[PDB]
Design a protein around this ligand. Structure first.
Ligand code: ABY
Ligand code: ABY
Ligand code: CL
Ligand code: CL
Lengths: 221, 221
C-alpha cells in the first residue's frame, strides 16, 4: 500500500486531530513539513490543494483537503465511525460540539489582544456549563466505557484529545466531571494512544509564540 | 417514522441548508419557529438541545443538533452522500469548501460596521480566485451534469444554494464560470428544487435588519 502523507507545518494547528486519529487507529504516517510560504506555493502550483490551503493528506490515491473530509475518511476506513447511520448521527453531533470548543481554544492566541481576557473567560464558562456537562450526561446515561455504541469510536478519541488541551488551559475545569476523567484515563491507556502520548511520537507540543509567528509567515495572516 | 421537524427561528441562518437538502430529496417536513428567548430556553431546559443551541431537527427518534450532523444523516438517509467511501471523501472536501464560503457570507451582517466593506471585498476575491475556480475545475474535469459520480448528491444542492447567495451579493461574480452557471440552471429545474424555489415553500428570504434584530433578541448576541 503506502503510508498516508500529512502536509502541514510543524505544529499542532489544524492537523493535530488527524495525527491523533491515525495514531489511535494504529496507522503509521509520514509528514512533509511546510517550512515557508514558498513551500506552500509549490504545493498550490503543483495542483495539490483544492482550495489552496492545508491540511492536505495524501491517502489511498487521493489528495484530501478539509480537516473534516480527512477525518471522515480515516474514521470510516478504520471502523471508528460507528456501525450504522444512526450511530454516525450521534458521533457527528458529539464531535461537532467537540470541534466547536476545540476551535475556540485553537484560535484563542489569535484573538485581538484586547479581546483575550473576556474570550478566555467565556471559553471556561462554556466548558463548565455547556460542553463538559453534555458529555458527562451522555456517559452517565448509558454507563458505558465509550461514548457511542459501547465500542471505541472517533468520538472518544476527539474528546480525549480535547481534554488534554483543556487540562493545559486550566487543570481544574474537569474536576467536577468524574466520568470525563475516567474516560480520559481509559482511552489514554489504550496501547496505540498510550504510545502516542509517550515521548517520541508525532504528537506535537503546544504552539509557542515563535511557532505562531512561523504560521503567520507561511500562511500570510 | 415521524415527519422531520425543524426547530429554528423564521429565517435562513444556520437551518437553510437543511431546508434545501430535505426539499431537494423530496422529503416533507414541518417547522416549529422559535419566536423568543423563552421558546429557546424551553427547548434547552427540557433537554432537547445537546449544546443548548439550534438548529435542532427531530428525525427518526433523534434530537439532532449541529448542522453537519443533521446534513450528514439526511444525506446518507436519502442516498445523497455518494456510493462509497472515496465518493464521500470528494463530497466532503467539496462541501467543506462550500461551508467555508457560506459561513463568510452568513456572517457578513454581523461584522463590525467599519470592517464590513473590507470583508465583502475579501469574500469577492475568494469567490473569484479560490472557490469558483475550484468548482469550475471539477465540473470541467468530467464534463457531467453532477459534481460527483454522475449522480445528484448533496454537493450539487449545497453548491447551487450557495450560488444563489453569491448572486444576491453580486450577480457578476459567476459570469466567467459557465459550467457553474449551467449547474445552477440544471439543478434549479429538478422537479423538487423547482418547487422549493417557487413561492409558498419553506425556502426563506434574505435576512433584513428586522430579522437580524429578532435573532439578536432570541439568541442574545
Ligand atoms: C492558532 O494556530 C493556527 C495556526 C495555523 C492556522 C492556519 S491552518 C492553514 C490554513 N488552512 C485553513 O484555514 C483551512 C480551513 C478550512 N476549513 C491555510 O492553508 N491558510 C492559507 C490560506 O487560506 O490562504 C490556524 C491557526
Ligand atoms: C447572520 O445571521 C445569523 C442568525 C442567527 C445565528 C445564530 S444560529 C443559533 C445559534 N447556534 C449556533 O451558533 C450553532 C453553531 C454550532 N456549530 C444558537 O443557538 N445560539 C445560542 C447560544 O449559542 O447560546 C447566526 C447568524
Ligand atoms: Cl482544514
Ligand atoms: Cl449548527
Amino acid at each position: 500500500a503506502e503510508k498516508p502523507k500529512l502536509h502541514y507545518f510543524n505544529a499542532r494547528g489544524r492537523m493535530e486531530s488527524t495525527r491523533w486519529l491515525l495514531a489511535a487507529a494504529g496507522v503509521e504516517f509520514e509528514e512533509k513539513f511546510i517550512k515557508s510560504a514558498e513551500d506552500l506555493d509549490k504545493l498550490r502550483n503543483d495542483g495539490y490543494l483544492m482550495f489552496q490551503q492545508v491540511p492536505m493528506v495524501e491517502i489511498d490515491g487521493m489528495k484530501l483537503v478539509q480537516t473534516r473530509a480527512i477525518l471522515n475518511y480515516i474514521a470510516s476506513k478504520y471502523n471508528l465511525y460507528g456501525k450504522d447511520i444512526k450511530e454516525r448521527a450521534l458521533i457527528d453531533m458529539y464531535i461537532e460540539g467537540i470541534a466547536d470548543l476545540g476551535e475556540m481554544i485553537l484560535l484563542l492566541p489569535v484573538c485581538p489582544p484586547e479581546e483575550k481576557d473576556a474570550k478566555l473567560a467565556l471559553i471556561k464558562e462554556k466548558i463548565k456549563n455547556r460542553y463538559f456537562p453534555a458529555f458527562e450526561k451522555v456517559l452517565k446515561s448509558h454507563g458505558q466505557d465509550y461514548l457511542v455504541g459501547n465500542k471505541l469510536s472517533r468520538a472518544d478519541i476527539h474528546l480525549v484529545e480535547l481534554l488534554y488541551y483543556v487540562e493545559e488551559l486550566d487543570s481544574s475545569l474537569i474536576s467536577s466531571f468524574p466520568l470525563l476523567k475516567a474516560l480520559k484515563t481509559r482511552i489514554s491507556n489504550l496501547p496505540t494512544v498510550k504510545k502516542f502520548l509517550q515521548p517520541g511520537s508525532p504528537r506535537k507540543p503546544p504552539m509557542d509564540e515563535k511557532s505562531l509567528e512561523e504560521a503567520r509567515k507561511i500562511f500570510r495572516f
